[PDB]
Amino acid sequence: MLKKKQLTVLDLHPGAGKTRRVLPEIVREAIKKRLRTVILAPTRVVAAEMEEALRGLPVRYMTTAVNVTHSGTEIVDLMCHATFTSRLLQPIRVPNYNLNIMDEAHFTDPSSIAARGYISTRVEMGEAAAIFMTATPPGTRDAFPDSNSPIMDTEVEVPERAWSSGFDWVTDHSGKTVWFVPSVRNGNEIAACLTKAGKRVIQLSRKTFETEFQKTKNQEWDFVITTDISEMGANFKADRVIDSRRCLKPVILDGERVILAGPMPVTHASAAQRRGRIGRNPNKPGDEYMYGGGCAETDEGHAHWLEARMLLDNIYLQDGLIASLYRPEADKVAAIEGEFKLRTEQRKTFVELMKRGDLPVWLAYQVASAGITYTDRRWCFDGTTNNTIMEDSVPAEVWTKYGEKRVLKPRWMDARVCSDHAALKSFKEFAAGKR
Ligand SMILES: OCc1ccc(-n2cnc3ccccc32)cc1
């Protein structure tokens, strides 16, 4: 695998030991061959699990998820997918890694797709080697891969709302269930219904995942209600997955706004990862996978692949060359390489709107490309009436940094800034000039 110009897809089935068995063998070989190596973890939770798998090996943990004293002599770096792409975008030196290892390489967040684009382009140029570790590479059509123990697969109607009757199988279960929902708001309603029926429920989503995932270890629980973030190497001692088989799809309409379309079917890769949360213990056969819909290739025309192009157009590779998307996922977007390349000062603005602003990539791009500076929030208030953001069925209002109460009416509307109470709170703080 470690030979230059090679990209290896390590596609062992979920739970086959890619992270805890194969990765340390790769890292030992890389250190023997003096290969400057990066390991990319999808989440801080996975970064911390990797530290335990790699304990004893000289690895620099570029994450405060790991409390360690480095020797200063490590040639293997470990960081999150998003940290890698973030450092590439910023005026910070990123070494030209001889070996690029991406764990949970199916992750479809924009920064992960961009990282795979950059890495696969370096390999195609003859500059580097890469290993992409995932049971579900792009375009996989198999939702039911192999497992460590037999799984009971059942197609069944799954609730997406509070229910009073007709789903006794949900609550009659005496084990632990991981339940994949299409959104935070949908999970909130299911979680409230289970709580009212006497169940102990933990909710996971992107913003809460590091903090809340620890509860799955520290407290007894009956249900984990999760969004798709638990597709990225989240491990549970569970005996059942309930899978809506539904997700939200960010869609750019008419180049001018982002909507959260659906819910609609998950990809086969997502469904396989959701199912792959169970059947992991060869001593516990008959874990259950209950699934409530079919799969579809809903990654086609998904905003994340366009956002990945906006990130890659703004990463230096060599002169004016621009990294391509990883070939198997390159058709998911109709984009022109370089169309989103910003001049130096607009690029800095773009980066700060994502990093400090915490805005979605698409929205950061609209603001930066308009020649707006990071602290200029006038655009949060001067949009069309149809861009009015609602809070409890009334227009949302903030006090501007000038001390004026104004209706939130962004010039560019991206549904992800108000998809749940926490998102809208963060966007209100941004519009007010509070970060
Ligand atoms: O680019 C942002 C960012 C992310 C991670 C870190 N970081 C945390 N612990 C570290 C140890 C070694 C090198 C970098 C480290 C710094 C900066």
Curated annotation (Swiss-Prot):
Lumenal side: 1-435
UniProt modification remark: Acetylated by host KAT5. Acetylation modulates NS3 RNA-binding and unwinding activities and plays an important positive role for viral replication.
Motif (DEAH box): 103-106
Chain positions found as N6-acetyllysine: 207
Subcellular location: Host cytoplasm; Host endoplasmic reticulum membrane
Helicase ATP-binding domain segment(s): 1-155
Residue span(s) of domain Helicase C-terminal: 150-329
Quaternary structure note: Forms a heterodimer with NS2B. Interacts with NS4B. Interacts with unphosphorylated RNA-directed RNA polymerase NS5; this interaction stimulates RNA-directed RNA polymerase NS5 guanylyltransferase activity. Interacts with non-structural protein 2A. Interacts with host SHFL; this interaction promotes NS3 degradation via a lysosome-dependent pathway. Interacts with host CEP63; this interaction disorganizes the centrosome and inhibits host innate immune response.
Protein name per its UniProtKB record: Serine protease NS3
Originating species: Zika virus (ZIKV)
